[PDB]
Amino acid sequence: MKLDDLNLFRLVVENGSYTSTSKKTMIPVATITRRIQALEDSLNLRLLNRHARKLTLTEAGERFYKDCSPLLERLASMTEEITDECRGASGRIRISAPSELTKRMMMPMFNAFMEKYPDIHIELMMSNQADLDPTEWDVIFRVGPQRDSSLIARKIGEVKDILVASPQYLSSHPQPTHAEELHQHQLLKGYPLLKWQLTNSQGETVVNSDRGRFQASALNVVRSACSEGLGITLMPDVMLREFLEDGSLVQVLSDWSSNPRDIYMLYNHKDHQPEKVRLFIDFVIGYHL
Amino acid sequence: MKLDDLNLFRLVVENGSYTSTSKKTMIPVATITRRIQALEDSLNLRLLNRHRKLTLTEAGERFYKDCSPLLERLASMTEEITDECRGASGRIRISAPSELTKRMMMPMFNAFMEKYPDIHIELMMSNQADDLDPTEWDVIFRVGPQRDSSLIARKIGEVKDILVASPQYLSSHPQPTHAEELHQHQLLKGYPLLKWQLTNSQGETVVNSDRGRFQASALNVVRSACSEGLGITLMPDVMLREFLEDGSLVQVLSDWSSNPRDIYMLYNHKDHQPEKVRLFIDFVIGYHL
Amino acid sequence: MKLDDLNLFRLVVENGSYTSTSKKTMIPVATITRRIQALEDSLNLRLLNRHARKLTLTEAGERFYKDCSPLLERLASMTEEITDECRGASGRIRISAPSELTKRMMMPMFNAFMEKYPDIHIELMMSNADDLDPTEWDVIFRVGPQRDSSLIARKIGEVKDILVASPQYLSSHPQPTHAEELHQHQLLKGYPLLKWQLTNSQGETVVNSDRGRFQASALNVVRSACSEGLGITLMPDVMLREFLEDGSLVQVLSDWSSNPRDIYMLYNHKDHQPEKVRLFIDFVIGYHLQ
Amino acid sequence: MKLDDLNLFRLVVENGSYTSTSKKTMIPVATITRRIQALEDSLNLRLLNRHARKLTLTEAGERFYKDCSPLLERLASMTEEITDECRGASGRIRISAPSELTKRMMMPMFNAFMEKYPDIHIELMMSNQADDLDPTEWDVIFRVGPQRDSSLIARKIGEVKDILVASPQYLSSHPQPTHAEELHQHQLLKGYPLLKWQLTNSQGETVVNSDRGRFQASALNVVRSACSEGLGITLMPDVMLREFLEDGSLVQVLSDWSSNPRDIYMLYNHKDHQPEKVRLFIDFVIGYHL
């Protein structure tokens, strides 16, 4: 009344806010705003209290969400169950990937898939660590060690993290020969490489947990700070090729190795996988890197 | 999905055809066509043959088998909730100032409840909010503004704080002429009236900050102490009506006034307000004092 | 600095709100805002984050509280136990009491005390559960058990709760002849008497947890509603006495009885204890009430 | 309280007289006399014989000084110690900035700041939803669009124009759109927050595109790469595009159709009530402007 406005209302409640819902459903905030307002205007009832930060349900809001959500869910669930069996070389694949590395590793592959399959659309959702329920997703990309899960997992690669510094910084601060000396250096750390675990040739492991001169939630900005000679950082070698090439960044502590992090493609057990998802999985497999 | 289109597909299967369904729903046949077509588009699946007796495809039979029952419960369920939620009967949550309510609000509340025996009231009282979160209340009564929300604010009354004492106290204690002489008297003070800021006829403003012989977190007990001739207090005019009229308490320093305090009513626009709350709001508005 | 401003800052933090601190310190929210602002202006540092109704502590705030709080506490405790021994029998007694029954029951006694001991002043706070720092109070009155704590406890009375309604109401609603029939009546309930537990002489107990036609956080406004013939309520007999007297309210199901609620006086053990506090305790123990 | 009068009392004892205390603290002799008496009146006790003409403490006086003065002393040393650390030009600061724009628009500045101040460390967090964050967790907040109002001081540091781009290769097989309305016939690549496209021409006509793109992402970056791969048209900040137009990997289309420009704000509490640590950052940004 309308059912889809009511179902959009359900989504808003589960994601906590309009912006959060927009990011997860890929629906513009302006459209969510409008449809929720239309619903309230049809009911003559305010379902949500909007004053930030927290969105809260009115008495009517609680009543609708409590009673109607279960059925709405079973409906969306039952529909998917049918569309998953039917067809087809068309549709939209919903993908979750780690915020970092997707740009330089995944996108080339994703772009290639959309070229081979112009009728298959992609909704890419990137969240760092993501911690998220697998069932709201067609395919999941994770980095590093995992645990059941029990989803179908396949190693599609691995990333090697190395320590680097600009020559400008190194001329000022003589480079360390032991990982323990890092405490005497300006360190630059970006998520999720905040806790450095390094092992050398003698089987000696040192763990650096310093907060660093510069700590960021993403690695690109840290990489930048490093180029400007603000200290030493730990970064995926794949992000360093260009700078190692031109020598603006140089590797340090080469005897000290950080354990390579495996790249995984995860997906749900179905026995009935939609053609769109089957096509995607097999494409990623045959793809290199 | 849309769900409303899936629901339309249901009514169509029930009624027997577009025209049949168009007559019962007043939905233009061409509309039903467009919307059923957009549904088959989203699914990339043909649900029924639009070519003359309408027949459901294997996918059509599937969708109607599983979804129709849920669509139906949901349809009646949403009907029931709205009927109750915007109905006149039901419980109402109200916040009012403690200590001033019994004398001012209760007659208004009692009258309301008598007029509307099916509307029930839950009344929380506080001297401290102000602070409390509005999303938990249908209507809020407070002293002074605001501060500051989207809540519609209506000034429905005012209180005038006056100084009183018993004939007995004034027998052994010479009545004060100037408010500065309050320093030589036994003062009875109660929250929220602790800092006495008194202005007289000539514009002279004196402030009494003395802790006072007796201090309570509520005025009503400070009132009894005053009747026992224990000293002078500052209290709302309405709480003193009878005692002033029976002689128990006599007013002093009548020319020394504090700033009047307005009583406001707070609520969200009646537009999207349940009939329960609308009736209470209007009743209060149509009420004297 | 001022040091009193700092101490107030501490008091605010420990309560975790401006409003809360206002009713607890007998200082208006406005004066509190003024002084906290003064403190931050003299420091040129922001201690609290206010705009957010949560009221958080900033880096500087966290630091000032952590390091100065212990000294402030010891200081306030020290100047207390110095003016305790050197002074007397004058001074102020901080008293905690229930909002429910104080006015009707304690005030006559409290008034009599202040009349007998003019130089002894009283700071009285009615409790909603603080809950509940004993060392902040000179004397504490509560209703019911137990708690129990390390406090010294004297039972000084009790209250019996009865069911009443106006003749007007009973005229159109014949009084109930069994506790169970309350489910069929308009009920008016006030804190802390929302859950009615009634017992007859035959051992039978019935519990009424109905939300009620009218539910309030205090009993006085409920009494008012009951007088307008709005229904049946459960209330301390001491608050109903003169209304039973004039027949404006009438008891029903005296057949059934609610558990009497004990009234206690609680105080921290100390020797020799401040003279002002001995006088009060002694006065109460020998005082005639219900 | 008043702790400050008690503290003044302490000073007097240590100085030996009102006048030597006035000379020390610059507080007028009449003021000292008035505040000491005011203290004595709140205690109803005498601490001093000011007429003695030679410092003489009462029994209460000796008691208060001996037990309290040491506490006051540590309190003064401590508040001075703490305000000294908050006025230090070092320490860590928490900064929040926009997901996509920080790298392009603000990192050069942050880098420059850290070079200038090696003892000030930066904790940087990027997010898409500037309204969903708690301002009390951050020293400085950079965000797109005006602040969901708070007590923060706001400062516009820049802005971004969102333009439409495609790769030359995409245009090889897809003739360029000459009207924003023709976008429905093209492949669109969209990324939050730019999902609903609202475009206005030089005549004030506004067209809105809410189509679901063949590719949609939670961030604009990966959208750019898809555009470079020739997968369609996208709407993106010019600051994220300029260098790709310049290297020839992208071209602008429908340039006469402008999108509502978005301002970059810098939010902070109050430069005065801020620890030197954070004030140096705010002033650095303000004058930078290089």
CB contacts of B125 in chain C (<8 Å) are: 216-218, 221
Residue D237 exposed, middle or buried by CB count within 10 Å (0-12, 13-18, 19+): buried
Q: Which amino acid is at D69?
A: S
Residue of B174, B169, B196, B184 whose CA lies nearest to B257: B196
The reply to whether B137 and B229 lie within a common domain is yes
For this entry, resolution in Å reads 2.7
Whether A219 and A143 have beta carbons less than 8 Å apart is answered as no
Distance, CA of A24 to CA of D272 (rounded, Å): 41
CA nearest to D92 within chain C = C59
The secondary structure of residue D87, as a DSSP letter, is T
Residue of C185, C199, C186 whose CA lies nearest to C256: C199
* Token pair recorded at residue B162: 């006056």
Distance, CA of A85 to CA of A276 (rounded, Å): 11
The reply to whether D142 and D235 lie within a common domain is yes
Whether A12 and A48 have beta carbons less than 8 Å apart is answered as yes
Question: Beta strand D162-166 with D233-237: parallel, antiparallel or unpaired?
Answer: antiparallel
Q: With helix as H, strand as E and coil as C, how does chain A read?
A: CCHHHHHHHHHHHHHCCHHHHHHHHCCCHHHHHHHHHHHHHHHCCCCEECCCCCCEECHHHHHHHHHHHHHHHHHHHHHHHHHHHCCCCCEEEEEEECCCCHHHHHHHHHHHHHHHCCCEEEEEEECCCCCCCCCCCCEEEEECCCCCCCCEEEEEEEECEEEEECHHHHHHCCCCCCHHHHHHCCEEEECCCCCEEEECCCCCEEEECCCCCEEECCHHHHHHHHHCCCCEEEEEHHHCHHHHHHCCCEECCCCCECCCEEEEEEECCCCCCCHHHHHHHHHHHHCCC
The reply to whether C155 and C222 lie within a common domain is yes
Distance, CA of D200 to CA of B97 (rounded, Å): 52
C194 touches chain D (CB under 8 A): no
Distance, CA of D211 to CA of A31 (rounded, Å): 12
Distance, CA of C98 to CA of D1 (rounded, Å): 28
* Token pair recorded at residue A32: 């969510």
Cis peptide leading into residue D177 (ω within 30°): no
Residue D14, domain CATH: 1.10.10.10
Contacts of B165 (CB under 8 A, 6+ apart): B173, B175, B226, B229, B231, B232, B233, B249, B250, B252
Domain final residue pick, C36, C64, C89: C89
Whether D190 and D234 have beta carbons less than 8 Å apart is answered as yes
- After which residues does chain B break, using C–N > 2.5 Å? 51
Please count the structural domains in chain C. Answer: 2
The reply to whether A81 and A110 lie within a common domain is no
The reply to whether A253 and A269 lie within a common domain is yes
The reply to whether C78 and C177 lie within a common domain is no
Q: Which of C43, C50, C78 sits opposite D83 (nearest CB)?
A: C43
Provide the sign of the torsion angle of the four alpha carbons A220, A224, A229, A230, taken in this order.
Answer: negative
D98 touches chain A (CB under 8 A): no
Distance, CA of D86 to CA of B155 (rounded, Å): 46
Distance, CA of D93 to CA of C72 (rounded, Å): 29
Residue A241 sits at φ, ψ, to 5 deg, of: -45, -55
The reply to whether A116 and A186 lie within a common domain is yes
Question: Beta strand D162-166 with D215-217: parallel, antiparallel or unpaired?
Answer: unpaired
| Chains contacting chain D through 3 or more C-beta pairs under 8 A | A, C
Distance, CA of B194 to CA of B212 (rounded, Å): 9
Distance, CA of D117 to CA of D281 (rounded, Å): 9
CA nearest to B92 within chain C = C214
* Token pair recorded at residue B105: 């609000």
- Residue D43: HSE in the Cβ half-sphere, 13 Å Cα cutoff: 27
The reply to whether D119 and D61 lie within a common domain is no
B60 touches chain A (CB under 8 A): no
> In DSSP terms, which residues pair with A122 in a beta bridge?
A93, D215
Residue B227, domain CATH: 3.40.190.290
The reply to whether C28 and C97 lie within a common domain is no
Question: Beta strand B161-165 with C261-267: parallel, antiparallel or unpaired?
Answer: unpaired
Q: Which of C122, C221, C229 sits opposite B123 (nearest CB)?
A: C221
Domain final residue pick, A89, A120, A152: A89
* Token pair recorded at residue A166: 């600009």
Whether C83 and C95 have beta carbons less than 8 Å apart is answered as no
Contact D118 A186 (CB under 8 A): yes
Whether A263 and A156 have beta carbons less than 8 Å apart is answered as yes
Question: Beta strand C152-159 with C205-208: parallel, antiparallel or unpaired?
Answer: unpaired
> In DSSP terms, which residues pair with A208 in a beta bridge?
A196
Domain range for C9 is: 1-89
Q: Tokens 């059934």 sit at which residue?
A: C256
Residue B171 sits at φ, ψ, to 5 deg, of: -70, -50
Contact A41 B4 (CB under 8 A): no
Domain final residue pick, B35, B66, B88: B88
A84 touches chain B (CB under 8 A): no
The DSSP-derived string for C52-83 is STT-EE-HHHHHHHHHHHHHHHHHHHHHHHHH
Helix (H, G, I), strand (E, B) or coil at C273: coil
Provide the sign of the torsion angle of the four alpha carbons A123, A129, A135, A141, taken in this order.
Answer: positive
* Token pair recorded at residue C144: 């019911």
Helix (H, G, I), strand (E, B) or coil at B118: coil
How was this one solved? X-ray
The reply to whether D274 and D158 lie within a common domain is yes
| H or E, element range at D259 | strand D258-259
Cis peptide leading into residue C2 (ω within 30°): yes
Of the residues A96, A99, A127, A168, the best mutation for testing chain D's interface (the one with the most D CB atoms within 10 Å of its CB) is A99
Whether B175 and B201 have beta carbons less than 8 Å apart is answered as no
C65 touches chain D (CB under 8 A): no
Residue of C278, B66, C220, C263 whose CA lies nearest to A79: B66
E-strand spans in D56-182? 91-98, 120-127, 140-144, 153-160, 162-166
* Token pair recorded at residue C236: 């301390």
The reply to whether A37 and A116 lie within a common domain is no
Quote the longest CA-to-CA distance of chain A: 73
Distance in Å, alpha carbon of A114 to nearest chain B alpha carbon:
18
Distance, CA of D194 to CA of D220 (rounded, Å): 8
Helix (H, G, I), strand (E, B) or coil at C142: strand
Distance, CA of D37 to CA of D47 (rounded, Å): 9
Contact A124 D196 (CB under 8 A): no
CA nearest to C67 within chain D = D78
CB contacts of C50 in chain D (<8 Å) are: 151
The reply to whether C149 and C271 lie within a common domain is yes
